[PDB]
Amino acid sequence: GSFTMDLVEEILRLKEERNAIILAHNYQLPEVQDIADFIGDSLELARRATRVDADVIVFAGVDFMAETAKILNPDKVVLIPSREATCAMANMLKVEHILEAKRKYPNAPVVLYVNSTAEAKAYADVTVTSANAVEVVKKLDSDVVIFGPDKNLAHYVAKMTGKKIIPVPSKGHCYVHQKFTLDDVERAKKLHPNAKLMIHPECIPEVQEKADIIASTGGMIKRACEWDEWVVFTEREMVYRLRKLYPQKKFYPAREDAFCIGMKAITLKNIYESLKDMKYKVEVPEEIARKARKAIERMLEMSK
Numbered sequence: 214g215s216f217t218m219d220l221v222e223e224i225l226r227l228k229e230e231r232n233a234i235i236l237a238h239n240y241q242l243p244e245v246q247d248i249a250d251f252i253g254d255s256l257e258l259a260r261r262a263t264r265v266d267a268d269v270i271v272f273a274g275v276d277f278m279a280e281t282a283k284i285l286n287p288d289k290v291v292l293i294p295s296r297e298a299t300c301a302m303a304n305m306l307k308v309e310h311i312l313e314a315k316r317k318y319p320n321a322p323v324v325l326y327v328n329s330t331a332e333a334k335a336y337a338d339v340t341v342t343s344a345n346a347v348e349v350v351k352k353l354d355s356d357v358v359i360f361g362p363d364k365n366l367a368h369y370v371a372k373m374t375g376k377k378i379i380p381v382p383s384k385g386h387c388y389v390h391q392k393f394t395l396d397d398v399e400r401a402k403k404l405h406p407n408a409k410l411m412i413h414p415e416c417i418p419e420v421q422e423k424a425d426i427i428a429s430t431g432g433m434i435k436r437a438c439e440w441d442e443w444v445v446f447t448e449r450e451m452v453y454r455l456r457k458l459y460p461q462k463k464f465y466p467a468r469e470d471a472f473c474i475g476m477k478a479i480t481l482k483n484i485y486e487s488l489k490d491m492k493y494k495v496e497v498p499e500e501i502a503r504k505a506r507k508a509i510e511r512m513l514e515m516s517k
């Protein structure tokens with residue numbers, strides 16, 4: 214035939230030529246999800262990054278996630294297709310916040326959401342994600358923990374563990390999940406009265422209280438078998454992921470306008486260019502990386 218390769222075919226060929234794997238987050242565009250080798254939540258992506266046989270990891274996600282993969286694979290090439298793929302919640306937490314909390318509470322473990330910079334993780338005793346934060350905090354040997362950046366996840370952790378949670382910083386949150394209100398809950402239940410509600414713990418507490426299940430996107434996938442019809446209170450591309458996994462169920466976005474600009478910095482074109490040009494190479498300074506790796510490997514040990 215006369216036709217040549219499209220972007221998908223170019224990517225497939227370059228993945229072979231580079232001995233590369235494409236890891237994608239659940240909030241990636243559908244056409245990016247469709248070319249990824251593995252798709253998951255933050256914990257699943259971290260765990261998957263400990264069994265990489267490929268030489269090159271193309272990370273269809275935000276920079277903190279790519280940095281986590283690099284911390285776990287210092288001697289592989291990790292590529293981020295755009296350096297503008299970044300997380301507003303993670304940027305809210307600075308070293309100065311951690312140091313001030315450690316001064317007040319020197320005996321409190323420092324528990325940092327993976328939505329955090331590599332520099333911040335160097336100060337964590339253990340990292341967490343939305344999937345394992347309750348379990349990890351429960352098991353730590355202290356009734357007081359320093360926790361951040363996300364204050365809404367911190368609220369959920371405090372509720373479920375009964376422990377004293379010292380937030381760092383004071384107001385960390387995700388603007389995507391802050392879009393959900395009690396009015397969205399009322400509207401969803403009126404439009405879909407037989408559906409149950411899957412709610413991310415980055416949503417505000419009063420919205421969390423309306424959930425049938427509170428879960429990371431990975432937990433949403435794991436527990437979707439419990440009902441046939443769900444309203445999805447997270448970033449709207451998760452609806453595509455759930456529909457692909459469970460074509461026989463029904464999924465509805467809680468809000469179509471719950472979009473993460475940083476996630477959508479990743480495009481099919483810039484994944485192609487990432488493999489073609491071997492860019493942008495993610496690097497983490499050795500001293501930071503070694504300290505962060507200790508905290509991440511502790512997380513993986515404490516949460517299977």
Ligand code: SF4
Nearest residue numbers: 300301302387389473
């Ligand atoms: S959805 Fe929220 S927490 Fe996740 S990368 Fe985007 S801004 Fe960060």
Ligand SMILES: [Cl-]
Nearest residue numbers: 234265266267
């Ligand atoms: Cl692999």
Ligand SMILES: [Cl-]
Nearest residue numbers: 240255300328
């Ligand atoms: Cl996220």
Ligand SMILES: [Cl-]
Nearest residue numbers: 438458459461
């Ligand atoms: Cl199934």
Ligand SMILES: [N+]
Nearest residue numbers: 353354355356
């Ligand atoms: N102890």
